[PDB]
């Protein structure tokens, strides 16, 4: 039971509830042995000549008292144990989410979304089930079973209990074996059903072609064949699933028969009394359950160990980007500069970038445009602290990025992703990511500056749409408006204007120039109109800037004459 040891921290943190649970469980187990023995004693008194109304009152009252005590203590231990299980589930969920919120892009590249969702959806269930139910079944198998066995061996008989106990180990072994076999056949049948589902989806997605070629009968035939196969697999599963009830019924009826027969052949010898025989029958009836509990434990422990070993591995992943120690005290960023930056995406080809060696002086906006794959979003990816440092130095007016802390830097940078990532939440609140204080009307001012005030009524209601993922050309506008409301010292526009009209494009760019005047502004685009004003324009060829000239030097030298296209 290594899972119970890997969770040592949890049990150490919660030892009062669990010790109370164990104490109450043992007390209930001890108390529950009384009712059947009292029934046996009552029958014995009945048979003999000593039974008066006083004895009947005694038995009725004591039975009621034991019933009430068992009820209350059972409620309390169940509550104290499954509350602990719920607590463990909640703790694991909040730890996993807190860890995910700290993880950088490289981790999410290594880890697929499906694996993380499964770990946060199923493994936590397995570990919580361990913590509660595995403990319950361990107590049942170790204490309840032995308690009942020793009670039947001492109070009732040591020969009858040995004789009537033989079939139950066999029942447990058979249950385990049939569980394994049914699990195997069930995974096979589930594979068959998955194949059928894949076929159904594949023949319902491309329905256009299937209908256009009047093949809607061969499709039906193939679906019928797949259904026949899945039905055959289900029948294979059922052939074994039907062997659970019969085997347990046989091996429990045999136990009852052995007990009754060998007690009738013992009462003849005067080594028992009918009361003790009835007590033995009830004891076997209650002892049935630990046999299933043993298998439940032996299965849950392994499932929990695997799931916990999976939840711990995904949790103990070192942070990709390290917040610096003793961060330098810099109020604001001035003249950005790159000395020699050759970035390389983890698990990439050759370099993917080479020394950029350019400077962006405070307040001077630079626009970068070029070829797809040459890399113009890699510069801002370097600047955003999304991936570990590269080479050389990214000097922020003297102190490199690696020394400025993550919080303050993320405060400076205003980022507008090329791939739009707005969240499924109120537009009025989705735009509000930039600054939570929000005042009241600065959001409206930001909308005006971004020129999203064009949205007067064309969207449902007002500033309440669940951008249900309502479509439109408003996603880029909302992103830019949010980044503008953030009021950043540095604005990074990643291909933001790749969808709006040219007129609105000019409006937005000239507004940013005429509204963000004393601060830097990065314009990334493949259309040479937005970068028109930029005082240092960069065109990247593969991994190196073709030239460092301005607009006039660019348009004169042999770089890329795409503005000669002029797009009109």
């Amino acid at each position: 039971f290594s899972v119970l040891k890997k969770l040592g921290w949890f049990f150490k943190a919660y030892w009062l509830r669990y010790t109370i649970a164990i104490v109450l469980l043992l007390a209930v187990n001890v108390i529950e042995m009384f009712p059947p023995k009292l029934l046996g004693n009552a029958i014995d008194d009945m048979k003999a000549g000593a039974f008066t109304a006083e004895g009947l009152l005694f038995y009725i009252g004591i039975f009621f008292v034991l019933t009430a005590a068992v009820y209350i203590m059972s409620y309390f231990w169940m509550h104290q144990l499954f509350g602990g299980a719920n607590l463990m589930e909640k703790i694991l969920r909040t730890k996993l989410m807190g860890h995910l919120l700290t993880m950088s892009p490289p981790f999410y590249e290594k880890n697929r979304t499906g694996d993380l969702m499964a770990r946060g959806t199923n493994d936590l269930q397995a570990v919580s089930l361990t913590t509660g139910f595995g403990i319950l079944t361990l107590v049942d198998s170790t204490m309840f079973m032995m308690t009942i066995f020793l009670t039947m061996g001492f109070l009732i008989s040591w020969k009858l209990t040995f004789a009537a106990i033989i079939p139950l180990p066999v029942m447990a072994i058979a249950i385990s074996l049939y569980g394994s076999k049914i699990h195997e056949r069930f995974t096979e049948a589930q594979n068959a059903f998955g194949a059928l589902n894949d076929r159904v989806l594949e023949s319902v997605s491309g329905v256009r072609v299937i209908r256009a070629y009047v093949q809607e009968t061969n499709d039906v035939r193939r679906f019928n064949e797949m259904t026949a196969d899945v039905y055959q697999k289900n029948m294979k599963v059922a052939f074994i699933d039907s062997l659970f009830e019969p085997t347990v019924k046989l091996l429990v009826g045999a136990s009852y028969l052995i007990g009754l027969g060998y007690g009738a052949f013992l009462v003849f010898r005067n080594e028992l009394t009918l009361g003790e025989l009835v007590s033995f029958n009830v004891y076997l009836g209650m002892m049935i359950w630990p046999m299933f509990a043993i298998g439940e434990l032996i299965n849950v422990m392994q499932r929990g160990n695997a799931s916990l070993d999976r939840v711990n591995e995904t949790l103990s992943y070192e942070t990709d980007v390290t917040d610096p120690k003793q961060p330098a005290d810099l109020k604001e960023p001035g003249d950005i500069v790159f000395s020699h930056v050759s970035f390389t995406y983890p698990s990439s080809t050759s370099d993917n970038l080479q020394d950029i060696s350019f400077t962006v002086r405070k307040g001077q906006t630079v626009g970068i445009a070029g070829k797809t794959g040459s890399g113009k979003t890699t510069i801002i990816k370097q600047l955003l602290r999304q991936y570990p440092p590269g080479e050389g130095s990214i000097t922020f007016s003297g102190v490199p990025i690696q020394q400025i802390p993550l919080d303050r830097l993320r405060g400076w940078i205003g980022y507008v992703p090329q791939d739009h990532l707005l969240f499924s939440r109120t537009v009025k609140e989705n735009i509000l990511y930039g600054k939570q204080d929000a005042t009241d009307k600065e959001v409206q001012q930001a909308i005006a500056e971004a020129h999203f005030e064009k949205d007067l009524h064309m969207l449902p209601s007002g500033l309440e749409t669940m951008v249900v993922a309502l479509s439109g050309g408003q996603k880029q506008r909302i992103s830019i408006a949010r980044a503008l409301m953030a009021n950043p010292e540095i604005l990074i526009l990643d291909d933001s204007l790749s969808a709006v009209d040219a007129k609105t494009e000019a409006a937005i760019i000239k507004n940013i120039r005429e509204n963000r005047k004393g601060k830097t502004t990065f314009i990334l685009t493949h259309r040479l109109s937005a970068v028109e004003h930029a005082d240092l324009i960069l065109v990247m060829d593969g991994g190196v800037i073709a030239e460092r000239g301005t607009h006039q030097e660019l348009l004169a030298n042999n770089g890329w004459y795409r503005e000669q296209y002029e797009r009109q």
Binding site: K90, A228, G261
Partner: protein, 657 residues
């Protein structure tokens, strides 16, 4: 209406269900006659000594020997009809005493030395004598063979019960599986009979779910209702019949207990539905929040929103945990401790009834009835918790049944039709068409043209200008609202769909690749065989077939984007269509399909009437009739050469870059 349809579908395959019910009934009979054997064994063999004894014959006349005389019980005796010389065995404390005379009225007993007086009126005192352990065994000996016979009978009935339990369970599972298979076949047939309007609105996931997941839910319901409700009902009916056969004054108490199951069932279901609904909703919300955070984490980190998203996640976690705790409380209180309390109250009722019988009676007490009652009540109280659990669960299966049967009951459909032998020549005439996907809208305003036997016709228009809406309207995926279309000499709407679609074939922007072999994909597994597929290779596919690892390149999912178009055009060539309605093809993405896309296109286009919707306008140099879409209307025609369309910016130099 869910139950009515479920019953109608179960009436199909009724032989299996009836046989399962009969086998279950036999198995229940055997299992429930086991405890009656137990009662008889307790009452006649262990308690046999209590009955009266008479003087016996010298031989083994069912007789036992005591000192110088031998006695025999009042039952196994054979008609000596003697009333004197009686005897009795009376148990006091733990020892048995012998009375040589009839003691008349019997009650409470206490012995000092040899009195063993019977105490409401204390005047009777017989003469007693202690029985040694050997004497008692000698007295009990005659019942050994009856004991053995009853034990063997119990075992035989047990094995029969085992066999028939297995049989009934297997047949119930078979019936459920066959019912679900029939339901799936019918659902898929109806899906294949649906119109494309239904498909377009609902995503693929929804239809796939309705086909395969709701049917699985129905399977779970059928297994639940059959194996747990009907089985439990029969089991309880048999148990109650046995109890009534045992003692009637004590079975009415269990009948009054039966309403307890109903009352608690309804209360627990009422609370559980609410708690489980809230728990499921909050769990779905938490999963959605986690997925929305993993995706788009970059922005969350960028805007330092890690303190508010975690706040909302913790709020959801607290709500879910609180509801889980409440559900735990309800479960603990209502289900299991309550089952235990009911069982102990039943024990108390047994003790009360039998003690009241015993206090004022001589021989009313029967411990066999008590043991049988205990066993039957232990069996009865087993599956109640499962019953309530399934009763609470049935709602989801009911909802899935509602969805599936609403899908099956849809009235709007289309007739199958049959393929037509005649090959319609290449001729597609559009007298006028007006089509819109909504009501009051007009997506296509006025389109009229005609295509000859051999021609390459192409549509000109901006993105979202209804260019492939005519592809939709030609295959009759969406019927014309008010216009008309004409192939050969009859309107498209006067002929069966499957006859029309035999004339004409499609190729789309994304070639739909079907699972299986490549040779199967280009043929879709039709009756046609042999050079049907190979001929495609000899027409325009030269490199892939030489990569012959297995017949026709048997292979598995995904190739890239060029070989997909190659396979699609191979299919279109194999099927030998007539009108060959093509679609936008993205062709330079890989290498121009190794500079073979044009060859494949112009080899399939031969000897047909072919419509090209290609985005690149340079690929339509050959077209004789080229049409334009003024957002659903023809405003000019011509060709890059015949008319001035090459000039006037309609054919942009930018499109020729």
């Amino acid at each position: 209406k869910i139950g009515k349809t479920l019953w109608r579908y179960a009436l199909l395959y009724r032989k299996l269900l009836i046989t399962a019910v009969l086998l279950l009934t036999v198995a229940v009979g055997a299992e429930l006659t086991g405890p009656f054997i137990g009662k008889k064994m307790i009452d006649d063999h262990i308690l046999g000594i209590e009955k009266t004894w008479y003087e016996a014959a010298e031989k083994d006349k069912n007789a036992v020997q005591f000192h110088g005389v031998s006695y025999v019980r009042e039952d196994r005796l054979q008609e000596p009809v003697s009333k004197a010389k009686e005897a009795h065995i009376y148990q006091v404390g733990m020892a048995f005493y012998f009375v040589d005379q009839a003691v008349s009225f019997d009650g409470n007993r206490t012995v000092s030395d040899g009195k063993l007086t019977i105490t409401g009126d204390k005047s009777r005192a017989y003469a007693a004598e202690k029985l040694t352990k050997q004497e008692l065994f000698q007295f009990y000996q005659p019942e050994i063979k009856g004991m053995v016979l009853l034990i063997c009978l119990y075992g035989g009935l047990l094995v029969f019960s085992v066999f028939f339990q297995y049989g009934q369970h297997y047949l119930l599972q078979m019936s459920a599986n066959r019912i679900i298979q029939k339901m799936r076949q019918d659902v898929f047939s109806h899906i294949q009979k649906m119109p494309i309007r239904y498909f377009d609105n609902l995503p693929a996931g929804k239809v796939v779910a309705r086909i395969t997941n709701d049917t699985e839910a129905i399977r779970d319901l059928y297994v639940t209702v059959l194996s747990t409700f009907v089985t439990s009902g029969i089991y309880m009916f048999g148990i109650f019949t046995a109890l009534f056969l045992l003692d009637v004054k004590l079975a009415f108490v269990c009948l009054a207990i039966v309403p307890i199951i109903w009352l608690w069932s309804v209360i627990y279901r009422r609370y559980a539905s609410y708690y489980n609904q809230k728990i499921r909703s909050i769990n779905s919300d938490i999963n959605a929040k986690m997925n929305e955070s993993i995706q788009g984490m970059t922005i969350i980190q960028a805007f330092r929103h890690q303190k508010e998203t975690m706040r909302e996640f913790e709020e959801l976690n607290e709500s879910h945990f609180y509801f889980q705790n409440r559900m735990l409380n309800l479960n603990s209180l209502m289900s299991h401790n309550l089952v235990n309390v009911i069982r102990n109250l039943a024990f108390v009722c047994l003790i009360w009834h039998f003690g009241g019988a015993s206090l004022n009676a001589a021989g009313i007490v029967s411990i066999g009835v008590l043991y049988a009652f205990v066993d039957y009540l232990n069996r009865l109280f087993q599956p109640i918790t499962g019953i309530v659990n399934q009763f609470s669960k049935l709602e989801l299966a009911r909802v899935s049944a509602g969805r599936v049967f609403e899908l099956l009951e849809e009235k709007n459909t289309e007739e199958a039709g049959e393929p037509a032998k005649e090959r319609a020549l290449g001729r597609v005439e559009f007298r006028d068409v007006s089509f819109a996907y909504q009501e009051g809208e007009e997506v296509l305003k006025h389109i009229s043209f005609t295509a000859q036997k051999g021609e390459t016709v192409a549509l000109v228009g901006h993105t979202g200008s209804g260019k492939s809406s005519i592809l939709n309207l030609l295959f009759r995926f969406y019927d014309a609202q008010k216009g008309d279309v004409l192939i050969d000499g009859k309107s498209i709407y006067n002929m069966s769909r499957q006859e029309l679609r035999s004339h004409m074939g499609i190729v789309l922007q994304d070639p739909y690749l079907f699972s299986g072999t490549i040779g199967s994909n280009v043929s879709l597994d039709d009756e046609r065989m042999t050079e049907e597929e190979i001929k495609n290779a000899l027409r325009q596919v030269g490199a892939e077939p030489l990569l012959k690892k297995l017949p026709k390149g048997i292979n598995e999912p995904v190739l890239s984007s060029g070989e997909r178009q190659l396979i699609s055009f191979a299919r279109a060539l194999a099927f030998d269509p007539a009108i060959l309605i093509l679609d936008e093809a993205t062709a330079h993405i890989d290498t121009e399909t190794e500079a073979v896309i044009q060859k494949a296109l112009d080899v399939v286009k031969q000897g047909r009437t072919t419509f090209v919707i290609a985005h690149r306008l340079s690929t339509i140099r050959n077209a004789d009739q080229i049409l334009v879409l003024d957002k659903g209307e023809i405003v000019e025609r011509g060709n890059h050469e015949e008319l001035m369309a090459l000039e006037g910016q309609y054919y942009q130099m930018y499109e020729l870059q």
